[PDB]
Amino acid sequence: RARVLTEAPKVTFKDVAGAEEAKEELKEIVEFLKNPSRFHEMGARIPKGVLLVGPPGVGKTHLARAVAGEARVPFITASGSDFVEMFVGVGAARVRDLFETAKRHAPCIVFIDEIDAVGRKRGSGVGGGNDEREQTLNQLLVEMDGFEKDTAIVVMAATNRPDILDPALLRPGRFDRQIAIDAPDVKGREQILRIHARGKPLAEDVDLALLAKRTPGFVGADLENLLNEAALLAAREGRRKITMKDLEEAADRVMMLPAKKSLVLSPRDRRITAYHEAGHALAAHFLEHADGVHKVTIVPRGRALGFMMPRREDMLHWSRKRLLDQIAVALAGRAAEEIVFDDVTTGAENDFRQATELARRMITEWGMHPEFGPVAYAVREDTYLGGYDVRQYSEETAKRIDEAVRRLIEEQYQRVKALLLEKREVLERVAETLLERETLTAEEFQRVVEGLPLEAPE
Amino acid sequence: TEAPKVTFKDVAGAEEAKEELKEIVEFLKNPSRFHEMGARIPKGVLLVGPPGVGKTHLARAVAGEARVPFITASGSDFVEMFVGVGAARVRDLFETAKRHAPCIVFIDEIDAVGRKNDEREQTLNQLLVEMDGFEKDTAIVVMAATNRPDILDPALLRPGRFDRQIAIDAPDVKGREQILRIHARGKPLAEDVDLALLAKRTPGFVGADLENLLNEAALLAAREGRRKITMKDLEEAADRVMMLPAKKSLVLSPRDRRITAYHEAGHALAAHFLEHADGVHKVTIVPRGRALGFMMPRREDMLHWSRKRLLDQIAVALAGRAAEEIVFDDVTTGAENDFRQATELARRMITEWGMHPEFGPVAYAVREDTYLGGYDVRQYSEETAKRIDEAVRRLIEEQYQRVKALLLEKREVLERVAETLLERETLTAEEFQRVVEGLPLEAPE
Amino acid sequence: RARVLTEAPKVTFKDVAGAEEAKEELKEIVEFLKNPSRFHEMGARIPKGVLLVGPPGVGKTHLARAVAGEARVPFITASGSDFVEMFVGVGAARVRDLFETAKRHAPCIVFIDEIDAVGRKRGSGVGGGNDEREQTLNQLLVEMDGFEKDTAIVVMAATNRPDILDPALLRPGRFDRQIAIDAPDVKGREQILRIHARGKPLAEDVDLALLAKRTPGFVGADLENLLNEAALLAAREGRRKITMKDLEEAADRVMMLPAKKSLVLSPRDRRITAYHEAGHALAAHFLEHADGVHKVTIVPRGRALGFMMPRREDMLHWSRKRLLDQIAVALAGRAAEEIVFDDVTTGAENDFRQATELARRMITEWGMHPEFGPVAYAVREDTYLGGYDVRQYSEETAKRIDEAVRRLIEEQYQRVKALLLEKREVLERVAETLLERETLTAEEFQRVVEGLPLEAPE
Amino acid sequence: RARVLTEAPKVTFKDVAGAEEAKEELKEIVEFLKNPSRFHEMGARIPKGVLLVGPPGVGKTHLARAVAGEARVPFITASGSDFVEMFVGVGAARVRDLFETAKRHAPCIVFIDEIDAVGRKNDEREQTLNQLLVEMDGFEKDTAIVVMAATNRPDILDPALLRPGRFDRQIAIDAPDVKGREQILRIHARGKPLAEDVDLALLAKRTPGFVGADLENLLNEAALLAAREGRRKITMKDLEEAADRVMMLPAKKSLVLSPRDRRITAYHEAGHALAAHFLEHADGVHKVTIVPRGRALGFMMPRREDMLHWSRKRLLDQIAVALAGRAAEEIVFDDVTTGAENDFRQATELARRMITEWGMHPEFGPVAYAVREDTYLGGYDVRQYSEETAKRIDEAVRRLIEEQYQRVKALLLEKREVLERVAETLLERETLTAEEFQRVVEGLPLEAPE
């Protein structure tokens, strides 16, 4: 059993705001539900599964539903959690019979939420994390490969950390689709703030616009529970209409609730994350011999891994030189704040990991000619049921690797300190602009860097 | 049932497999010349290669040089139906084939058939027992073809069942010519290229993904109003059916390729020298194909070699880096295997074989073997493991400096082999032999 | 489900060539299928299972079938591989229902091939090699112990490495039979070359004899695909009859196909193996104080373990002295080539392992009074479901054990160098003879050693 | 409902050779089988379910039968093999009916052979097992009934079948022996004549490991070796050949030892005997054997279920009582040693224990570097110290054991003349019995005994 939406769902792409970089890219999954009789017999093939990735409450389930109602298709939902909570066995059963439930509705959309809770295996938690994930997952993995021609289905997956998933789900036949959603956009914020002000009236003066800029960082489900709260301000005393001075307080109420010990995205938390994101920007960008790419924004959650992972599962000769600057742009994030900032450091880590991983690879798995040779002290596997890293050198050669990666990262970090330092004027320039406007497209960047404005025709 | 067109004169390149196939051809031609004349023939040939290489086209193409009922069954349909009925499609289809002796019985999407609750099993067990029902006084060659035999039911590979395959290596320039020139009959061409410089301006391109290019080239001309395709109509036939596969099928840069081409020469040369030297020969560059091949003899590697060779054999591996280290703009690039396979020798050679370092006759490791699995259990004190480790840097460094030398001291044959390779996207044994031996090769065969 | 041979199999002991050291020793298994009504009620018992051991395509399945048709019994076949390929569970099911399939045919022969794929457990591959082997095997192990009196069955097993099997299969009640097959014999080669020349004629002059000697090393399935290929030489052009000049080429075609990068048993590969096999021979054989046994041949695959394993699973007080020469005859193999040969070494290992295993035993498990005392640094178990070695000393005592077995084997190897060296004339003598005639019975040996001929009469 | 052996069932305890140990223990069933009226009212209780421990063909069934012959009673029989070969419920029925049968024949003995086929641990063996159980669980106070059984491997016998009230007693029957080989051949002497120099004296010896059954079989065949040649009189050269013919057929599946092999174990098992025997400042026990198969089982029973709270001092003799094993041989034997591992292993686990787990005050002292994983099914000890402390422990154990081993080398050497006497007598008579040993030690011959 699961959550069935029969008769006909509401919620469609008209009830979904912004999400362009997703909507149009999903329109082909939709038309398969509409007419699978013009896909099976033509010659092409359809995903059968699509994982969309993003923060908590970005529009994910929202778009998942939206695809069902648009394609006028039954909506099947089940949060991953429910499949592992049980003993060793019933994990497998619940999946098969969810898919003998979804099979009966041809077509339909199945939608597992936090599939996060079924994908991963390595050798870490030996005891009670092995056989319950070994089994349960390798059922969906087999039921999905059960979708041949004349069975129209779309298994949609939600997840807040995409990288923590077993490399077999993104592999052929199974979940072979990549759309993440950076939804808290400017114009998006408006549209979301508009769409969720249909019920309840407002005798306003701000036009929700001056609320968008006063809630720059903010997700839609964040947004909704902002307004819905704003109204209950009135219904708490019985007031006709709610002002925009009743709306600021509605953002000063949700600013201190996400957790248990109350926390926020303060004028110094943006101001940090900004210098930090300018660092990377201002790093990967050079002239004569430097190496990297470009497109700058604030608030992604996932995406900032791109400078390795979604590329090692896409094979090609990278380069010692390339990687080092890669490792440089890695530490840029830190560097930045080390410099500008209050000479204390914010725990903003992943970067270091990416750098460090990139650099034990440096030494061991690749042959990059340290003091360690072109010898192969490791063996990242990439198998059909298995396929993840383990490896043998020997305690000593381990210190040997350790010391080495300290040396490598330290020294490379110092690099990106200088270059940030040396370019210090531009940091303020970028970060400041960044703070102020959230997003710069890279040619826009190209300008702000060469001390020049570029205003929006707004 | 009637005469099925397309012979071996109408299938480009792929000569290797054509030669191996005359075995089915003569037998398909005169089975009476076999049964009584005490012999036996394959029965079940599978094809190994990507989608759109020569595959079905070739199994069909037997029947065209064989003159025979080329029966067909799409494997996808075998599983889409119902219980028993999917297995029925088989039981009936094979009764059908018996009456048409001699013949060929082709199965496409054999993947959909041969994997390892009920669906795929139904058709599988049926397909099996019917193959297990082919007699001496019975003539019948079953064909099939798939991209990934890695995921094919091993039972479907048993002797008596599918106990033979030929690989068809995908593109090649001389094979891209051939193939475009074969699809030249249809409509006119006045362009400077003669599909010569097209076959090149297209890099990795299977045959199918060329027919598709030419089919579209016409619809690029006639939609503009042209009974005559050009270059700027055929080149565009590429970049249009090149930026849609690119999202799921790989492409390489004029640096990427120019690497692999030096890189793979290093190797070739490496295994080639004179006096006090030990190796082999025949070279390629193929985007997807080179991922499968190193893995087959990464599992099923085995003869009882000699210490000396391992030491060339190790350096034939490291020549891969080497080359690039020499020729290339003093950078190196993620190309791991060569090391890994070179280290497992050494690591083996110390530890497991008796090769008389500082380690000598002892057995510091044993090999866990047989079919399904094969990886080696270790057994030494931590110290002896430092020992082994250092060891393996030594043995390999030494070797790598070796092949750096052998390349350097030939670094002019390198940037020739590489260069002709880079140019002609494959040397063939003797071809190489010639390129090495300071001699040009004109417009061949 | 499996491979059933109903109605009546063909292939019998008349269709099996040579294999004497097996045929007569199997004749008692056969007569049980013939008349189980004269075995259940008499007083004796029958194997219920027999594992025969040898190379790839030696006559194994060939003899397995041969036993069935001879005993006029249904033939059940299933290759081990099929039982592990599946998930955790269905491994067990497939065995039980194979044996509820074979139970229905009383009597009958079940024949698992490469049972190699169901027998072994230690603690090496922690992850995905444990519970699929724990279960699946301990089903056949239980179904076989299900064969009481009034259920006639013979579970025949094929395997190319016998030593890699769980010590429980060769244990009581289960597979309690030992016949390996060194089949590529001289007279055997003939008979096999004869038997497989029934179809297709030959206008010969060599009499297949001068082909036997021109294909000394060669197995029967090797042989068969030699002739079957020879004929298709003709059928490729349409030739009546095939010469023996069409037969040499038929061995020059199969000489370069066993693998992917083409390899052979060259005039120097025999010539190596020969000196190698003469080493062991010329080792274990002495006078005054030396220790060992005798019977010399070329091409066994398995057998050359005898100087320990099939004896530690048969309990008795061996001796420090005895073992050292045992360890000596061990390295004889290397030694040999070290000397005669091109002063390069062929990777022919097992010997070393045998030696090394014998000598960590030396130190640890037994009490042989090194610098390590009569202390017990090890505990080879021999249990009823488990039963395999592991043990505890401590890292240091470990380097301690290591250095020791280096000293021990090195020094013992040196010994066997000298003794070979010192007997150098005899090596050439034996090996040369060996090369030339494949097999010397040990009294024949006794002669060739004391510089005397002994030619063959028939 | 299987074999109902009614009437007076022949063969008493006068017709069962050797095995005196068990006969004595069995009079307990005999007197009760003889006069149960003398028990029920006279407030007592008796075993109920005796199982026999020994190989196939020792004295087993023969003895359970032999109770009925000295007990004078209905010796009912049921073959366990047949309990499982039948059908569903029907196999369990055979039990339910057979036990109703036994009740009417009070007093009696109810024997189960092939009890293995019954008591192991989907449906087959369970059927008969649960039935066999509840029927034993239905034997009352005013009810007299002694169930017999006998198997070779109690190791693989369902522990539920060993519960109190069910099968809560067993006697072992040790297989051959020389004085038991005499006894047995002399018992099978009545049949046909003998004029040979041996009087089954020097046969009982010329045959080494030979169960009783594998002797009757020798003598049965000896006659058919004579009369087939035409002889109403068997000889030595007709009885010796009764051996080597029914000796080279079992040899393919049953073990044998060499005039060196045995002469080892005999010194070897002296080494031990002496070892645990001294005077002043010394701590041990006594009673010796040599039996080919039997000595594999016995070291294992107290390798699992070892437990009293000993004293530090003894362990140290107790360790050297173990090492003396090597010792002896090291001394007497042609300066070679032989794979005879256990002694060390068991000597090391003490030491290893003694350091580490017990409090014995090395350099290691009252700390608990290790704990013992216990209870029934399992028992092996978890370790817990830094690598260093493990070198520590290792060295330690070389030290403690070396020292000891040098000890018992001494004790043996400085007695090395009692050795090659106890060994020698053992080697000769294949078992000393407590006092016998005591006497051999104490410079005194022993003539043609009892």
Ligand SMILES: Nc1ncnc2c1ncn2[C@@H]1O[C@H](COP(=O)(O)OP(=O)(O)O)[C@@H](O)[C@H]1O
């Ligand atoms: N794009 C948006 N426009 C309107 N509502 C939104 C939007 N994004 C999120 N929501 C609100 O959030 C709720 C669910 O949030 P969602 O993003 O689907 O959770 P999650 O990201 O964990 O899957 C919806 O019911 C909807 O009201």
Ligand SMILES: Nc1ncnc2c1ncn2[C@@H]1O[C@H](COP(=O)(O)OP(=O)(O)O)[C@@H](O)[C@H]1O
């Ligand atoms: N060797 C070739 N010469 C000419 N055309 C080819 C060749 N190989 C493939 N093709 C084209 O590709 C089409 C299908 O390719 P094929 O390999 O037979 O199918 P698939 O690989 O998908 O099983 C053929 O119809 C043919 O037009």
Ligand SMILES: Nc1ncnc2c1ncn2[C@@H]1O[C@H](COP(=O)(O)OP(=O)(O)O)[C@@H](O)[C@H]1O
């Ligand atoms: N003794 C031989 N005589 C005749 N044919 C043989 C002989 N040995 C092997 N063969 C051939 O080999 C085939 C099977 O080889 P086999 O040895 O049974 O494989 P494996 O050793 O892996 O079990 C048979 O079909 C038979 O034709």
Ligand SMILES: Nc1ncnc2c1ncn2[C@@H]1O[C@H](COP(=O)(O)OP(=O)(O)O)[C@@H](O)[C@H]1O
């Ligand atoms: N103590 C003995 N004295 C005389 N005969 C014996 C003795 N022990 C065993 N036997 C012979 O062995 C036969 C069966 O041996 P027994 O031990 O009772 O059966 P099992 O051991 O197989 O259960 C008896 O019939 C008897 O002839």
